[PDB]
Design a protein around this ligand. Structure first.
Ligand SMILES: O=C(OCc1ccccc1)N1CCC(O)CC1
Length: 282
């Protein structure tokens, strides 16, 4: 069923809350036993948001391999994403270790460091060229190379150095800075442009490791970004684009991380983005 019509049918009937609860009821439940070990309590931002054991990213260290991060592998779309929480004061070194070890080119940040008067994630990248950051626990150095500030997003060029081998890599930081404190954006135009610019960078392409995507918990805004990208890629690839079922794509993605799309309003915004995105493509 053409989703644009499914959209108007749900809106006229005001059933967004009902569709959303149906997804919550049918979603996968897999064990998260490593996330709940007492040694990992200060590595989790939220007690109710954990990576499944089968899809968790493992750090390459014998001490403690745990980070709150999941690999979302989309087989038909041929895209992979790592979805993770906003880094904590004691996990900023783990975060950059993961980027290094997974060979990522891009980090996508969908939150501000402070929102609604509270800290939503650590200040985990340098703000000035001449004041670099050293992570002694993981033996990494991170330098700000350049910054491009636009009305709806900022793009930064970072240099990550493995101090053990003296190898360096260029990481691109894509920071969406205008998601409102309350609700979802009124139009998806600025969110779609932002996705286009991440795609244009190479960060989502198969010659690199998976993109790292985060917000505060790594399930809500983060869910919206990967769901929109995968649905638009499938519309490009298939003979019948009408066949793309956003609810079925979301349940596939929920096999790899719990809770993706946190509200009925985020579900409606994801439909609008794919639809308004489908409009521009034709
Ligand atoms: O918002 C856009 O279109 C919708 C869309 C974005 C990303 C992936 C699929 C569809 N952009 C910004 C403007 C640029 O010219 C190119 C398109």
């Amino acid at each position: 069923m053409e989703m644009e019509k499914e959209f108007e049918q749900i809106d006229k009937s005001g059933s967004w809350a009902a569709i959303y609860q149906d997804i919550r009821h049918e979603a996968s439940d897999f064990p998260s036993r490593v996330a709940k070990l007492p040694k990992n309590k200060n590595r989790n931002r939220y007690r109710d948001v954990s990576p499944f054991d089968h899809s968790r990213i493992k750090l390459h260290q014998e001490d403690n391999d745990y980070i709150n991060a999941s690999l979302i592998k989309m087989e038909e779309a041929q895209r992979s994403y790592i979805l993770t929480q906003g880094p904590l004061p004691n996990t900023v070194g783990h975060f950059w270790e993961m980027v290094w070890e997974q060979k990522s080119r891009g980090v996508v940040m969908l939150n501000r460091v402070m929102e609604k008067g509270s800290l939503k994630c650590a200040q985990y990248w340098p703000q000035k060229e001449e004041k670099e950051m050293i992570f002694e626990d993981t033996n990494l150095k991170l330098t700000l190379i350049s910054e491009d500030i636009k009305s709806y997003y900022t793009v930064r060029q970072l240099e990550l150095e493995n101090l053990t081998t003296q190898e360096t890599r260029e990481i691109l930081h894509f920071h969406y800075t205008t998601w409102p404190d309350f609700g979802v954006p009124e139009s998806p135009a600025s969110f779609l442009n932002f996705l286009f610019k991440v795609r244009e960078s190479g960060s989502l392409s198969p010659e690199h490791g998976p993109v790292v995507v985060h917000c505060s918990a790594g399930i809500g805004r983060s869910g919206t970004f990967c769901l929109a990208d995968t649905c638009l890629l499938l519309m490009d690839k298939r003979k019948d684009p009408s066949s793309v079922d956003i609810k079925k794509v979301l349940l596939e993605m929920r096999k790899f991380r719990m809770g993706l799309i946190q509200t009925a309003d985020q579900l409606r915004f994801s439909y609008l983005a794919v639809i308004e995105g489908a409009k521009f493509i034709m």
